[PDB]
Amino acid sequence: GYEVHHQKLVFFAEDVGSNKGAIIGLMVGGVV
Amino acid sequence: GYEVHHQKLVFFAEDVGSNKGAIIGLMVGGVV
Amino acid sequence: GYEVHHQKLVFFAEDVGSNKGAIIGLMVGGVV
Amino acid sequence: GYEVHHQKLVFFAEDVGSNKGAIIGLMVGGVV
Amino acid sequence: GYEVHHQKLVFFAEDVGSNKGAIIGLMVGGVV
Amino acid sequence: GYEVHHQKLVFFAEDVGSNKGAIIGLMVGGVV
Amino acid sequence: GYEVHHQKLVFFAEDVGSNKGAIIGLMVGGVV
Amino acid sequence: GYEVHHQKLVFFAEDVGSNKGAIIGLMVGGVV
Amino acid sequence: GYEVHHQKLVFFAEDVGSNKGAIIGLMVGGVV
Amino acid sequence: GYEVHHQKLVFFAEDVGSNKGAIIGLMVGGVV
Fold first, then answer.
1. I need a labelling partner for E8 at 20 to 30 A (CA). Which of C10, D17, F18, J13 fits?
2. Domain range holding E23?
3. What residues does Zn(2+) 2 bind to (chains A, B, C, D, E, F, G, H, I, J)?
4. What is the CATH number of the domain that holds B18?
C-alpha cells in the first residue's frame, strides 16, 4: 500500500504530438 | 509499500514529438 | 519499500523528438 | 528498500533527438 | 538498501542526439 | 508516393505486454 | 517515393514485454 | 527514393524484455 | 536512393533483455 | 546511393543483455 502527502505542482504541457508513453509530474508507483 | 512526502514541482514540456518513453519530474518506483 | 521526502524541482523539456527512453528529474527505483 | 531526502533540482533539456537511453538529474537505483 | 540525502543539482542538456546510453548528474546504484 | 506489390505474410503475436512501440511484419515508410 | 515488390514473411513474436522500440521483419524507410 | 525486391524472411522473437531499440530482420534505410 | 534485391533470412532472437541499441540481420543504410 | 544484391542469412541471438550498441549480421553503410 501507499501514501502521498503534502504536494504542490504547476506543470504545463504546451505541445505534445503523439505521446504514447508518459509525461508525468510526479509518478509514484504507476505503470504506463 | 511506499511514502512520498512534502514536494514542490513546476515542470514544463514545451514541444514533445512522439514520447513513447517517459518524461517525468519525479519518478518514484514506476514502470514505464 | 521506500520513502521520498522534502523536494523541490523545476525542470523544463523544450524540444524532445522521440524519447523512447527517459528524461527524468529524479528517478528513484523506477524501471523505464 | 530505500530513502531519498532533501533535494533541489532545476534541470533543463533543450533539444533531445531520440533519447532511447536516459537523461536523468539524479538516478537512484533505477533501471533504464 | 540505500539512502540519498541533501543535494542540489542544476544540470543542462542542450543538444543530445541519440543518447542510447546515459547522461546523468548523479547516478547512484542504477543500471542503464 | 509509393507502391507495394505481391506479398504473403503469416505472422503471430502470442503474448505482448505493453507494446507502445511497434511490432510489424513489413513496415514500409510508416511512422510509429 | 518507393516500391516494395515480391515478398514472403512468417514471423513470430512469442513474448514481448514492453517494446517501446520496434520489432520488425522488414523495415523499409520507416521511422520508429 | 527506393526499391526492395524479392525476399523471404522467417524470423522469431521468443522473449524480448524492454526493446526500446530495434530488432529487425532487414532494415533498409529506416530510423529507429 | 537505394535498392535491395533477392534475399533470404531466418533469424532468431531467443532472449533479449533491454536492447536499446539494435539487433539486425541485414542493416542497410539505417540509423539506429 | 546504394545496392545490396543476392544474400542468405541465418543468424541467431540467444541471450543478449543490454545491447545498446549493435549486433548485426551484415551492416552496410548504417549508423548505430
1. D17
2. 1-32
3. 2, 5-6
4. 4.10.230.10
Residue type, F28: V
**How far away is chain J from the Cα of H32, in angstroms, using its nearest Cα?**
10
Split into its structural domains, chain A has a count of 1
Residues in H 1-32 with any Cβ partner in J closer than 8 A: 21, 27
CA neighbours within 13 Å on the CB side: how many for C6?
5
Tell me the helix, strand and coil percentages in chain D, rounded to 5. 0, 50, 50
Exposed, middle or buried, B5 (CB in 10 Å: 0-12/13-18/19+)? middle
Chains contacting F (3+ CB pairs below 8 angstroms): A, B, G, H
**Exposed/middle/buried for residue I19 (C-beta within 10 Å: 0-12, 13-18, 19+):** buried
Report the C-alpha gap between F24 and F1 in whole angstroms: 21
Breaks in chain H follow which residues, C to N over 2.5 Å?
none
For the record, the C-alpha cell of G4 comes out as 516494395
Determination approach: cryo-EM
Note the resolution in Å, 1 decimal. 3.5
| Other beta carbons within 10 Å of A17 | 13
B28 Cα distance to chain centroid: 8
